Amino acid sequence: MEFNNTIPELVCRDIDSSLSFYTQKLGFKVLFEREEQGFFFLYKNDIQLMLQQLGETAWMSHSNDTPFGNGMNIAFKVESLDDLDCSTSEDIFLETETIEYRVLDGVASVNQVIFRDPDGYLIRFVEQV
Amino acid sequence: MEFNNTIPELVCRDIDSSLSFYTQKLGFKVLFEREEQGFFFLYKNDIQLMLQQLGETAWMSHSNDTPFGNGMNIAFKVESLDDLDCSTPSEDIFLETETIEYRVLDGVASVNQVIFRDPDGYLIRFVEQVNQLE
Ligand SMILES: C[C@H](c1c[nH]c2ccccc12)[C@@H]1OC(N)=NC1=O
Ligand SMILES: C[C@H](c1c[nH]c2ccccc12)[C@@H]1OC(N)=NC1=O
């Protein structure tokens, strides 16, 4: 199989809850799993994302009681936000908005939404317009 | 410009310290910046990464005192680990360079990998695929 050049791996306090969030709310599918390690490799179109149940094999930068994901957001580029459940929700960190960003070679106009997953990871979907 | 389909954005407690880490230890370069916002868009080969000074415009899941990046690691695929300053012993190294086989969808991925821990605790995993056997 082909691995994307950038794949986030999210340790999940409750992998069942996280799996339901990513599959049912965000439309990811399970590509493969190592279920005996609580590990799931998810995909949606061209994006990939790994989930890992919190446990002894997890790579934890801070203590287990430290809330997850602070400071970061993952920007996923999508052709459209239509297949996302952006109902406006405790799952929504930033409601759908159109924003102009000044970038290297001009202005990137985007439609974007940010979700906050069950452990606090921020997942930003960006549609370039 | 072409935006990668997956780009992490890391809020940095000390943007100059983080910029020095990513550019000097990990070999990223600045593609462009928004200086007024403390924002930097970095690149290295096919990898892109965003850094932003902790401040008014930062998207923060938890309180500012909550340590950053817990639970996540970003896996960056690279052709080689050679250029990376993986030198030990270092507080920058979370997982020393190792070769590991992973069971994947259609076989086994044999990789060389190293995990860095950046100045705020974000884990950056560099993965060199040695082979995949079906
Ligand atoms: C807005 C930029 C961006 C990230 N991913 C994208 C996918 C399609 C089009 C644009 C983008 C980038 O993100 C932020 N926070 N500032 C930036 O310049
Ligand atoms: C090891 C896998 C992987 C992530 N990025 C890569 C780049 C090249 C070859 C393999 C990979 C993936 O990561 C983890 N933790 N388990 C997995 O199956």
XYZ file of C-alpha atoms in Angstrom, chain B:
134
model
C 0.883 26.989 -4.690
C 0.179 23.341 -3.930
C -1.009 22.641 -0.397
C -0.426 19.104 0.828
C -3.570 17.201 1.673
C -2.415 16.959 5.314
C -0.546 19.818 6.997
C -0.080 20.007 10.783
C -0.209 23.406 12.400
C 1.673 23.631 15.693
C 1.172 26.480 18.108
C 4.573 27.240 19.630
C 5.187 28.630 23.098
C 8.457 30.234 21.876
C 8.274 30.607 18.089
C 11.955 31.463 17.715
C 12.999 28.375 19.690
C 10.638 26.190 17.679
C 11.723 27.725 14.360
C 15.349 27.047 15.254
C 14.499 23.429 16.070
C 12.605 22.782 12.835
C 14.991 24.611 10.549
C 18.306 23.644 12.131
C 17.732 20.185 13.589
C 15.112 18.966 11.124
C 16.104 20.890 7.978
C 12.850 22.692 7.255
C 12.924 25.978 5.382
C 10.493 28.895 5.556
C 8.346 29.115 2.430
C 6.450 32.172 3.609
C 5.431 33.877 6.806
C 2.779 36.178 8.180
C 5.005 38.154 10.530
C 2.249 40.141 12.246
C 0.596 36.876 13.335
C 3.773 34.987 14.251
C 2.907 32.445 11.550
C 5.403 30.435 9.497
C 4.744 27.993 6.662
C 7.653 25.543 6.484
C 8.619 22.980 3.917
C 11.130 20.194 3.521
C 11.127 18.240 0.272
C 7.499 17.069 -0.024
C 6.603 17.839 3.638
C 4.821 20.977 4.803
C 4.390 22.174 8.362
C 2.912 25.294 9.929
C 4.117 26.993 13.115
C 2.373 29.808 14.949
C 3.446 31.734 18.028
C 1.063 31.210 20.932
C -1.105 34.305 20.882
C -4.488 35.787 20.125
C -5.159 33.936 16.861
C -4.054 30.468 18.005
C -6.631 27.660 17.857
C -6.306 26.080 21.304
C -8.200 22.941 22.230
C -7.294 23.266 25.920
C -6.033 25.977 28.253
C -2.678 27.563 27.435
C -1.064 25.927 30.476
C -1.981 22.459 29.218
C 1.161 20.827 27.754
C 1.080 20.693 23.988
C 0.673 17.755 21.687
C -0.144 14.969 24.099
C -1.267 11.742 22.505
C -0.305 12.618 18.951
C 2.674 11.972 16.786
C 3.033 13.192 13.210
C 4.480 10.548 10.891
C 6.522 12.182 8.133
C 7.644 9.849 5.346
C 11.226 10.524 4.239
C 13.647 9.007 1.766
C 16.366 8.877 4.421
C 17.053 9.754 8.034
C 20.646 10.724 7.213
C 20.303 14.508 7.262
C 18.316 14.650 10.487
C 20.294 15.543 13.588
C 19.307 12.312 15.336
C 22.474 12.521 17.425
C 22.249 11.150 20.962
C 22.087 11.751 23.877
C 19.514 14.506 23.432
C 16.345 15.768 25.065
C 15.210 16.254 21.445
C 14.979 12.474 20.903
C 11.852 10.680 22.134
C 12.509 7.371 20.343
C 16.046 6.652 19.148
C 16.559 5.563 15.535
C 15.313 1.994 15.117
C 14.298 -0.516 12.457
C 10.850 -2.049 12.926
C 8.447 -4.194 10.928
C 4.794 -3.150 10.886
C 1.970 -5.391 9.746
C 0.015 -3.333 7.220
C -2.901 -3.760 4.808
C -1.278 -5.891 2.098
C 1.840 -7.151 3.886
C 4.685 -5.857 6.069
C 6.316 -2.428 6.035
C 9.932 -2.475 7.205
C 10.939 1.021 8.305
C 13.744 2.966 9.888
C 12.222 5.550 12.186
C 13.113 8.130 14.804
C 10.822 10.249 16.960
C 11.791 13.781 17.937
C 10.211 15.686 20.818
C 10.118 19.371 19.906
C 10.498 22.256 22.392
C 6.818 22.149 23.391
C 6.528 18.359 23.420
C 5.142 17.704 19.955
C 6.250 14.294 18.683
C 7.587 14.248 15.132
C 8.128 10.748 13.755
C 10.280 10.390 10.665
C 9.692 7.147 8.768
C 11.975 5.778 6.064
C 10.431 2.806 4.291
C 13.063 0.118 3.783
C 10.672 -2.182 1.917
C 7.125 -3.503 1.722
C 6.642 -7.239 1.197
C 3.234 -8.498 0.052
